[PDB]
Amino acid sequence: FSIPDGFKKCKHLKNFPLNGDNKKKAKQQQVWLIKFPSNVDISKLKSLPVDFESSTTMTIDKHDYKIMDDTDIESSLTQDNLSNMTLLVPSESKESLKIASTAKDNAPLQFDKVFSVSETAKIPAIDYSKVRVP
């Protein structure tokens, strides 16, 4: 196969310390998903107000932002594994991705926290005293 007369094989991957500080239900590690407009430079961040849990408003290059945190879609207090947002873990630059897990239980894990950066906008209120002239 090795299709798309526009693709190259992979040659460079990176180890994932999945278990160097993991312990089964003992290390409170997390994996997060965040959506970033291309307009932001992720490498130019320093910390993340995800700790606001909900009030994760954020200001990036004097631009005001909101960091959407959602339980839905994958932390629902309703079903076991409500996601197909599959994690594909590598190993080496010469090996293909792997299905995420926490032991050899053939079960896909979920992201502890899912965040989404949404650019806020002023949409300033109407100054009634100016508009409502009699």
Partner 1 sequence: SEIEIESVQDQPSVAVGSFFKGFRAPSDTTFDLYKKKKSEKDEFVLHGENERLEYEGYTDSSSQASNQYVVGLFNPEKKSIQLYKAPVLVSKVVSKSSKNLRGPKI
Partner 2 sequence: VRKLLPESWGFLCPVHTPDGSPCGLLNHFAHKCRISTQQSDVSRIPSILYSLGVAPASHTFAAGPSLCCVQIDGKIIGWVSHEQGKIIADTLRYWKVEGKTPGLPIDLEIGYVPPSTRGQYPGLYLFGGHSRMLRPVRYLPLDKEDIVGPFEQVYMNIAVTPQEIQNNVHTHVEFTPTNILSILANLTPFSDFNQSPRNMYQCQMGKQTMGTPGVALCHRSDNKLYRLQTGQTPIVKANLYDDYGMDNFPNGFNAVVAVISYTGYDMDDAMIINKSADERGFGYGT
Partner 3 sequence: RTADFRTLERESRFINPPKDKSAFPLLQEAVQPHIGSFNALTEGPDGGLLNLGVKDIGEKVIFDGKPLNSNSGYLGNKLSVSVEQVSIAKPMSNDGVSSAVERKVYPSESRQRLTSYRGKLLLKLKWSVNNGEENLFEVRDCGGLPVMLQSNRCHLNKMSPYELVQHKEESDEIGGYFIVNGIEKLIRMLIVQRRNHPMAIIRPSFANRGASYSHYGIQIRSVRPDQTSQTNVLHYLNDGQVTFRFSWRKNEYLVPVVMILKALCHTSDREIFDGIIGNDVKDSFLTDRLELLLRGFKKRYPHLQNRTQVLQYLGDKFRVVFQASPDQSDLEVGQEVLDRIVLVHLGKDGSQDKFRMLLFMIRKLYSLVAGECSPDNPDATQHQEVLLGGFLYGMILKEKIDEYLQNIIAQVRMDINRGMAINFKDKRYMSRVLMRVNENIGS
Q: How many residues bind partner 1 (CB under 8 A)?
A: 56
In whole angstroms, give the CA distance from residue 45 to residue 104.
35
Q: Positive or negative CA dihedral for 74, 80, 83, 86?
A: positive
CA-based max dimension of the chain: 76
- Interface residues with partner 3 (CB under 8 A)? 72-73, 76, 78-79, 82, 84
In whole angstroms, give the CA distance from residue 92 to residue 77.
36
List the single partner that 78 binds among partner 2, partner 1, partner 3, none, CB under 5 to 8 Å by kind: partner 3
In whole angstroms, give the CA distance from residue 69 to residue 117.
9
List the single partner that 111 binds among partner 3, partner 2, partner 1, none, CB under 5 to 8 Å by kind: partner 1
Per-residue x/- mask for partner 2, residues 85 to 104, rule CB under 8 A? Answer: x-------------------
45 binds partner 2 (CB under 8 A): no
66 neighbors 56 (Cβ within 8 angstroms): yes
Strand partners, 54: none
Among 26, 77, 88, 123, binds partner 1 (CB under 8 A): 88
49 neighbors 56 (Cβ within 8 angstroms): yes
Which residues form the interface with partner 1 (CB under 8 A)? 1-4, 6-10, 12-14, 16-17, 21, 27-38, 42-43, 45-53, 84-90, 96-99, 104, 106-108, 111-113
Which residues form the interface with partner 2 (CB under 8 A)? 35, 37, 39, 68, 73, 84-85, 116, 118-126, 128, 130-134
